Amino acid sequence: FDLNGNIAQEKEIVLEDGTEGTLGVMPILKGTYSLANGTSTWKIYWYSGVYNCSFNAKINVSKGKGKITSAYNPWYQFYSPGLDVKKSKLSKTSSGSSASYVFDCKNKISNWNVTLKASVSGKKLTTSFK
Amino acid sequence: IAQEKEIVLEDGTEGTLGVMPIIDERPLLKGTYSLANGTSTWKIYWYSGVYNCSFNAKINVSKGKGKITSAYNPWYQFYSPGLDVKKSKLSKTSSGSSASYVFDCKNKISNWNVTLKASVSGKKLTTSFK
Amino acid sequence: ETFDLNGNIAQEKEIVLEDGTEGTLGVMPIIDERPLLKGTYSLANGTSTWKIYWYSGVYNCSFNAKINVSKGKGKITSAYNPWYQFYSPGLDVKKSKLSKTSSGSSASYVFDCKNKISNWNVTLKASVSGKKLTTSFK
Amino acid sequence: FDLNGNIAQEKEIVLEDGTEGTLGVMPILKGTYSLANGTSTWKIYWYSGVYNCSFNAKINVSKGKGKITSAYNPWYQFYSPGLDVKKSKLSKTSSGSSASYVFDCKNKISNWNVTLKASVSGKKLTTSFK
Amino acid sequence: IAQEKEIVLEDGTEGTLGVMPIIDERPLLKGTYSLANGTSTWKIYWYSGVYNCSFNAKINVSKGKGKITSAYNPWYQFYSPGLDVKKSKLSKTSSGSSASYVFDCKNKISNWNVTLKASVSGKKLTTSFK
Amino acid sequence: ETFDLNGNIAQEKEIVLEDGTEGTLGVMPIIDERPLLKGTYSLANGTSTWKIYWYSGVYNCSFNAKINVSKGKGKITSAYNPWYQFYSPGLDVKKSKLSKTSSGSSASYVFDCKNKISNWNVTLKASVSGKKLTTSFK
Numbered sequence A, D: 001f002d003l004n005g006n007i008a009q010e011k012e013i014v015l016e017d018g019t020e021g022t023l024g025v026m027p028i029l030k031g032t033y034s035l036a037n038g039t040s041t042w043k044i045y046w047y048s049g050v051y052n053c054s055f056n057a058k059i060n061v062s063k064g065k066g067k068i069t070s071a072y073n074p075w076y077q078f079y080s081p082g083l084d085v086k087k088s089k090l091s092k093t094s095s096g097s098s099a100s101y102v103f104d105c106k107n108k109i110s111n112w113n114v115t116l117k118a119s120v121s122g123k124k125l126t127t128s129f130k
Numbered sequence B, E: 001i002a003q004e005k006e007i008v009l010e011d012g013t014e015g016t017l018g019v020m021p022i023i024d025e026r027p028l029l030k031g032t033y034s035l036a037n038g039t040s041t042w043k044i045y046w047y048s049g050v051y052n053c054s055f056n057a058k059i060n061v062s063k064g065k066g067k068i069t070s071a072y073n074p075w076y077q078f079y080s081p082g083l084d085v086k087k088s089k090l091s092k093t094s095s096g097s098s099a100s101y102v103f104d105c106k107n108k109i110s111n112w113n114v115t116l117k118a119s120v121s122g123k124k125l126t127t128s129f130k
Numbered sequence C, F: 001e002t003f004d005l006n007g008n009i010a011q012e013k014e015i016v017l018e019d020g021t022e023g024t025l026g027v028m029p030i031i032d033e034r035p036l037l038k039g040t041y042s043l044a045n046g047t048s049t050w051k052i053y054w055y056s057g058v059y060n061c062s063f064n065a066k067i068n069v070s071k072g073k074g075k076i077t078s079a080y081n082p083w084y085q086f087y088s089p090g091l092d093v094k095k096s097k098l099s100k101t102s103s104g105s106s107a108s109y110v111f112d113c114k115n116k117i118s119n120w121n122v123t124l125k126a127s128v129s130g131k132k133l134t135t136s137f138k
């Protein structure tokens, strides 16, 4: 039940009030750049008119493959009247494949999360913000 | 057919306490998709006026059977005045049989949850939202 | 006398503290080495899945339970797909949790609730002994 | 710096607004009764016009000394307009010397906790509520 | 004398960042009491118009030195309109050197904590509230 | 150009998402294999206790830190007695936590704050390398 693994496939539905609902599956902007052998420390951050946040990530590249050995020193300043940061959390995957600083936010009309993530694979450091 | 009984609680609340055997789960909406051997990465998502959310699923398939090796990058953004998302957890079963993004919601008149789920069985990938 | 109905079995003690409040502290020996009586009289050998649920004007909730009965003794191997909708103004759900005992003798979906005049928990419970499956909501 | 271990000893202080403060130390109503050899199950409870709560305690008396091996099935119904139960928790000491069901409550003029406790020492079961 | 510096933060906030070496702790109020060899149980408490709380401390003294073997039965009841006790934790140091009952408080105009503490050193039992 | 001042060292990327918001994602290599410079120039050998603190009109907080410096290298063996008073209407403290690094290289007392126009954390930090003790509050 799959033609090509290039486009999104969705199941649609119309709710009792005539509102569309989409259940979908899809195969799959970021910052990436080279690393060096041994251990290194990095400040991973994001800055905008609304969200500003960062943390430190210690990485260790043994052989030609590295991982995040520690994620610490979480900082943040969010400017926006009425915004409520219900929760914030910095965590590292057991493998150390990545670290994420996640904020669960809320205002008068919405609830959502924002995420600053750092990923290490081989000798490559990738960051993202969603 | 199910086996049930009508109970009237002390506070007057009249309800139906029941049990029924099921073959397949009954969500609001579901979808089934075939998988190819090897590792593949997919975005699982739901979009509606009020609820919007997703996560990524890393699926691996050795010969005939496959499972979810990783459920990550949980994202959501809900729009509705006065809505509160008390809790949001993305989790994966130990056997990788499935992953579920569950939201505990609340507002001036109700308390409920919504669930975006992805389960893998053999060559099949099943998505659902309830 | 205010007929507890379990008061005849338990040893109780009326006490009062600091606040000058009057309440009864009590202890009662209970039996667990007993089978179920009211439950769904049958659940075939092997493995099977079940939908446990309570539906009413205010409280609505359910969960799935895979049950495994090898030879004669049956247990719950899993309690999943917790779902709920507690629709009523004034009512607030502060916490919800689905759990299964170590033995798999029972699974409970507990909700911590509150309204303008009270605070309390409610439980949707499924219990299994031998080839019997029973439920309760209190 | 201690005469007799029978009475309370306090350090007093007068706050900026002429309010007394007492820091004190003191050497030290409950329900108690005999147990039997082997394992047993007990319902520990309290009932009043305001607070009603209970839990089950499994006890195991090996030799002539016993302990609580499990505390479970926490139930409660508190009647009082305006009362808010911020938190509730049932826990057992590692040694199993006792179990406690603690409620952190709050209303418009106060914050306090209430506690139903079960204690086992030798072949004796003691309960209390504070 | 202490070593400090006056800092004016970006938002205009003017403060004093300092460090000072101390011999003894400086709480709002303290008390010292002698202990006898053997095990003894004590109630540690504080009473004032607004704050009232206590816990029990099991102290053991082998020949000259002693420590807290157990800090239990935490109790509190605070009176003040609009006051919120966000958190309350009773904990004991691994070495039994001390136990502390800490309350995180809040109201329309302030955020703070209060601490009822008991520390044991040798033959001495020191109580304090800050 | 809006002088970041660290922008010259880090590699940054301006991006935009779903919301149509404009922000800069960035990564910067930093050094930790460096000693302290501004800190309290002395902390004698052996063991000593210190009161770390910040006092101001709105934020006030402090904690104690036992420091152990054997031979030449010094570390924090304990961070205790966390105390605070954040007195200001509109300001809400959502969480507070005192922590010490594994190494004892530093101790941090972090507060999650909020007001009608912003959400942010503030930290009272004590760091120790060799025989140097420094502090900061940002």
Ligand SMILES: [Cl-]
Residues within 6 Å of the ligand: A069, A070, A071, A072, A092
């Ligand atoms: Cl880490």
Ligand SMILES: [Cl-]
Residues within 6 Å of the ligand: C035, C036, C037, C038, C039, C134
């Ligand atoms: Cl029965």
Ligand SMILES: [Cl-]
Residues within 6 Å of the ligand: D069, D070, D071, D072, D092
């Ligand atoms: Cl237990």
Ligand SMILES: [Cl-]
Residues within 6 Å of the ligand: F035, F036, F037, F038, F039, F134
């Ligand atoms: Cl420096």
